[PDB]
Amino acid sequence: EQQLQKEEEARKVKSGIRQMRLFSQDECAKIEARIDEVVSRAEKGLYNEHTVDRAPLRNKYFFGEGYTGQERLYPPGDVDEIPEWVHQLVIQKLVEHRVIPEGFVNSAVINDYQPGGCIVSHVDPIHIFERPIVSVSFFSDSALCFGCKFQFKPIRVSEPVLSLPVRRGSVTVLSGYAADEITHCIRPQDIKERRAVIILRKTRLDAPRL
Ligand SMILES: O=C(O)c1ccnc(C(=O)O)c1
Ligand SMILES: [Mn+2]
């Protein structure tokens, strides 16, 4: 049956996921206030054009490096640099906890979700980003789904291969099978209240530029 295939796939996805709670209630509160500062600055028109991407239920803020399966890296300096508080409050903690080495992160993206927000099935562009992919969830708890046939064929398949809880203050690290061989997504029903995520990545040298 398809039950053995779904279990073997989930096994493979799991081996590409590492997760741990690194940030306390207070550390989150400090970072969450800084994320609110970023939303204000965007609204004040203080950022470069390509720094901010506005969409109905979700907003994206690109720092260090940003982009538009033919994604392209904007020319150097076209997006705002990674704010100091990100280096100080987020990247440092990860470096101290041996999640990623120092100097690795050149790209930080903040996704800001409304309740009812979602991300459609995708693979983090392999031509743009190196692995691993690190992400830290903030305002509330949610879930990350892997294997996303269901978003398009809910008749033939009603569930993802795997759902991963992403609680406030947790660090999720994706590599191998989980980052390369399978799509991920977030379902609208899994975002009940406001949610933000900071995604920390290194871009590839040969990432096709504009
Ligand atoms: O919101 C998230 O946690 C999340 C998870 C996986 N991918 C993305 C993305 O923006 O690519 C965001
Ligand atoms: Mn992603």
CA 12 – ligand 2 centroid, Å: 18
120 neighbors 63 (Cβ within 8 angstroms):
no
∠ CA 162-137-7 to the nearest 5 degrees? 10
Gap between the Cα atoms of 121 and 16, Å rounded: 18
Q: What are the beta bridge partners of residue 145?
A: 163, 185
Closest CA to 177 of 5, 16, 19: 16
Instruction: Check whether 111 is labelled as a binding-site residue.
Output: yes
Q: Which residue has a Cα nearest atom 11 of ligand 1? A: 124
Instruction: Check whether 122 is labelled as a binding-site residue.
Output: yes
CA 110 – ligand 1 centroid, Å: 9
Counting ligands in written order, the one closest to the CA of 137 is 1
200 neighbors 105 (Cβ within 8 angstroms):
yes
Q: Which residue has a Cα nearest atom 10 of ligand 1? A: 111
Instruction: Check whether 180 is labelled as a binding-site residue.
Output: no
DSSP at 127: T
Count of domains forming the chain: 1
Q: Using alpha carbons, list the distances in angstroms from residue 54 to 61, 62, 113, 149.
A: 9, 11, 11, 26
- Asked how this structure was determined, the answer is X-ray
CA 126 – ligand 2 centroid, Å: 11
Alpha-carbon torsion (200, 66, 192, 152), positive or negative: negative
Domain that holds residue 83: 1-210
Contacts by 146-155, CB closer than 8 A, 24 or more apart: 146/10, 146/13, 146/178, 146/182, 146/183, 146/184, 147/9, 147/13, 147/182, 147/183, 148/120, 148/121, 148/183, 148/184, 148/185, 151/120, 151/121, 151/185, 151/187, 152/121
Which residue from 67, 185, 199 has its CB within 8 A of the most atoms of ligand 1, so it is best to mutate?
A: 199
Residue 191 sits in a domain of what CATH number? 2.60.120.590
Gap between the Cα atoms of 196 and 208, Å rounded: 28
H/E run at residue 2 = helix 2-14
Q: Using alpha carbons, list the distances in angstroms from residue 17 to 10, 94, 170.
A: 11, 16, 13
State yes or no: is 67 an active-site residue: yes
CB atoms within 10 A of CB 41: 16
Gap between the Cα atoms of 210 and 199, Å rounded: 22
| Ligand 1 pocket, residues with Cβ under 6 angstroms | 111, 119, 124, 135, 137, 144, 166, 184, 186, 197, 199
Exposed, middle or buried by CB within 10 Å (0-12, 13-18, 19+), for 194?
middle
Instruction: List, in sequence order, the alpha helices (H) in 23-180.
Output: 25-43, 84-85, 92-96, 176-180
CB atoms within 10 A of CB 94: 20
The torsion angle over the Cα atoms of residues 170, 138, 125 and 200, rounded to 10 degrees, is -70
| Three-class SS state of 144 | strand
Token pair 């590492």 in the structure block, residue = 18
Gap between the Cα atoms of 95 and 103, Å rounded: 9
Instruction: Check whether 61 is labelled as a binding-site residue.
Output: no
